[PDB]
C-alpha cells in the first residue's frame, strides 16, 4: 500500500568514478529522491518546497558519514557493502509499521530496536557498528524520532492507472511441445496477475517475470509449456487495476 | 555473499517493424553491486544507452534497468550482455521477438 522507504548503500571500495554512498527515497513504487556522496545534494526524481530538500541534504550528509564510519568500526580490508532500509508502511489496519534494517555484504545483520533505542544484532560486527553510531551525537534519537513520528507524519503529507496491452503468443519449444507466453506491456500500478486456462480449467502456477520500464510503467510475462497442436485450447486472464474486470487474452492468430 | 544476476530483455511496447520503441534489459538479484551491462545490436555494443540508478530489493539484492530508444526491423538482432563476478563468462541474452 502506502510506504515511504529510503534505500541506503555504502561501499568501502567504490569502482572508479562511482559514489561511495548513495540513497534513493521511495513513495510506494515511485522514486522521488536521490542522493550520492559525489554530489552531496538531495535531489527530486520523476515528477517531483526548497526547505525540504535542504533538510534532506543535511540528514543524508549525516547518514553518509555514519555509513562510512561503519567501515572504520569493522577494520580490516573488506571490501564491504553496507545497506540500509529506513522508513514506514501504512497497513489496512491503519498502523504505521516502521522498518530499520541493515545488511552487511548482502546479509542482514543489524536493526534498530525501538525499545532500547539503539542499533543491534546477533554478531560482533553489529555490536561494533552500533557502538560506533552511538558515539555520533543525537544519531539514535534522530533514528527513533524518524521511525516513530517524522516518517508516519510525512507519509500522510506526501500522500494514475494505465492498463496493460496484452499478447498471448506461442513458440516451438522442443519436439513434442510449445511454450505459450502471456505478456503485459507498459502498465501502472505494478500489481498485476496472470493465469492460464486450458479449455476453461486453470493451469500453471501463475508465476511470471516482472520488470520496470524507464517511463515509470511496468512489464510482465508468464510462460507455460503445452503439448504441440494443443495451443488453441489455451487463453490468458489478466487482473489489473486499469481494467474494469479481468480480461481474457486469446492466442495470437498468425 | 554472491548472488548471480537474473536478466530480462523486453520491449516497452509490442514490437512493430519500423515503429520506434524502447529496448530494456532488466538485471536483478545480484550481489555484490559491481556489474557490466551492454545492449547489443547484431552482436555489437550500442553506445547511446541509458540506465537507472543502482538500487536494491527487500532481499538486499541489487537491480539495474538498461534501456535505449530504437526502431526494430526484420533483420536487426538485439541482445543484452551481462558480466558479473559470479559468471565464468559473460551472459548474452537475446531479445526474443517470438516470445
Amino acid at each position, epitope marked *: 500500500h502506502l510506504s515511504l522507504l529510503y534505500h541506503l548503500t555504502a561501499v568501502s571500495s567504490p569502482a572508479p568514478g562511482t559514489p561511495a554512498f548513495w540513497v534513493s527515497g521511495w513513495l510506494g513504487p515511485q522514486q522521488y529522491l536521490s542522493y550520492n556522496s559525489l554530489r552531496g545534494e538531495a535531489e527530486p526524481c520523476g515528477a517531483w518546497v526548497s526547505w525540504y530538500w535542504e533538510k534532506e541534504t543535511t540528514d543524508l550528509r549525516i547518514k553518509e558519514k555514519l555509513f562510512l564510519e561503519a567501515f572504520k568500526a569493522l577494520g580490516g580490508k573488506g571490501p564491504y557493502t553496507l545497506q540500509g532500509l529506513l522508513g514506514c508502511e501504512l497497513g489496512p489496519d491503519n498502523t504505521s509499521v516502521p522498518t530499520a534494517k541493515f545488511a552487511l555484504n548482502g546479509e542482514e545483520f543489524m536493526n534498530f530496536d525501538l525499545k532500547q533505542g539503539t542499533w543491534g544484532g546477533d554478531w560482533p560486527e553489529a*555490536l561494533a557498528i552500533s557502538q560506533r553510531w552511538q558515539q555520533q551525537d543525537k544519531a539514535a534519537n534522530k533514528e527513533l524520532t524518524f521511525l516513530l513520528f517524522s516518517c508516519p507524519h510525512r507519509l500522510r503529507e506526501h500522500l494514475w492507472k494505465e492498463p496493460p496491452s496484452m499478447r498471448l503468443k506461442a513458440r516451438p519449444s522442443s519436439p513434442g511441445f510449445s511454450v505459450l507466453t502471456c505478456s503485459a506491456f507498459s502498465f501502472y500500478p505494478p500489481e498485476l496477475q496472470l493465469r492460464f486456462l486450458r479449455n476453461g480449467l486453470a493451469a500453471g502456477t501463475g508465476q511470471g517475470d516482472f520488470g520496470p520500464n524507464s517511463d515509470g510503467s511496468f512489464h510482465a510475462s508468464s510462460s507455460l509449456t503445452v503439448k504441440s497442436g494443443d495451443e488453441h485450447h489455451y487463453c490468458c486472464i489478466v487482473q489489473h487495476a486499469g481494467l474494469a474486470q479481468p480480461l481474457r487474452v486469446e492466442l495470437e492468430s498468425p | 555473499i554472491q548472488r548471480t544476476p537474473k536478466i530480462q530483455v523486453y520491449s516497452r511496447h509490442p514490437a512493430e517493424n519500423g515503429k520506434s520503441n524502447f529496448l530494456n534489459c532488466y538485471v536483478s538479484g545480484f550481489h555484490p553491486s559491481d556489474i557490466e551491462v551492454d545492449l547489443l545490436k547484431n552482436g555489437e555494443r550500442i553506445e547511446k544507452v541509458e540506465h537507472s540508478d543502482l538500487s536494491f530489493s527487500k532481499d538486499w539484492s541489487f537491480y539495474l534497468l538498461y534501456y535505449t530508444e530504437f526502431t526494430p526491423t526484420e533483420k536487426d538482432e538485439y541482445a543484452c550482455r551481462v558480466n558479473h563476478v559470479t559468471l565464468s563468462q559473460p551472459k548474452i541474452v537475446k531479445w526474443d521477438r517470438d516470445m
Partner: antibody
Amino acid sequence: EVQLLESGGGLVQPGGSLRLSCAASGFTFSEYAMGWVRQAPGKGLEWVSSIGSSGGQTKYADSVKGRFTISRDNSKNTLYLQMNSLRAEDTAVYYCARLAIGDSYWGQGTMVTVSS
Amino acid sequence: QSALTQPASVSGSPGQSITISCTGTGSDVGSYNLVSWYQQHPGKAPKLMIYGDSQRPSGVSNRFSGSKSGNTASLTISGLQAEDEADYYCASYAGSGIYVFGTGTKVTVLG
C-alpha cells in the same frame, strides 16, 4: 572487571554426554555473542561453536555439528554447551570466549576427558 | 571447516625480529575476514595481541605488529625477548560467528 567462569568438565565414557556452563559477569551479557574454543592437550586451538547475542543464531565447527548444542540464558548470564555422543577426540580444555571485534576475554577453561 | 597453516617452529636471538606466517587467509569476492593473533603461555589461556589484521589491544607492546595480504597474514615480533617464548596462533573471523584457528607456531628465543 570482565569475568568468565567455566565449569562442568570431567571424565566421560565415549558415547556419554556432558554439559558445560560458563558464568559471566562484569559486562552486559546480552549484548555479546559468545563462543566456545577447545584445545586438546599439546595441540592447537580449535573453534567449536558460537551463539549470537540473543541466542537466536548458532554456528558449529564441522567436527562437532549434530553432536553439540550451544545455548544461553540471558537472564542468568550463563553460556552452555551440550555435548552428546562424545568421542576420544573431544578430549580437550574447553574455553568460554566473549566474541567481539577489538577485544577477546576468555575464561581459564574446564578440562574434559573422554576415555573408557 | 579446516585449519589455517603456520610453521610449527620459529626461533630467534634476543633483540632479533622474527616473522610468523599464516596461510589460508584469503576471502571469496563478496566476503571478508579479520585476522587475529593470540599468544599462549604454558598453562595460561590465549592472549590477544593483534586484531583486525594490524591492531594492537591497549597494553600490547608495540614490538608486536601484523599484516594481511591475499591468502597470507603475518605476525612480526621485534626486539625479541625471552618472555615472548610462547605458542602463537592466527585466527580468522569470517563474520556471522564463524572462526577458524591456525595450527600454531612455537617461538623459541635462543642464546
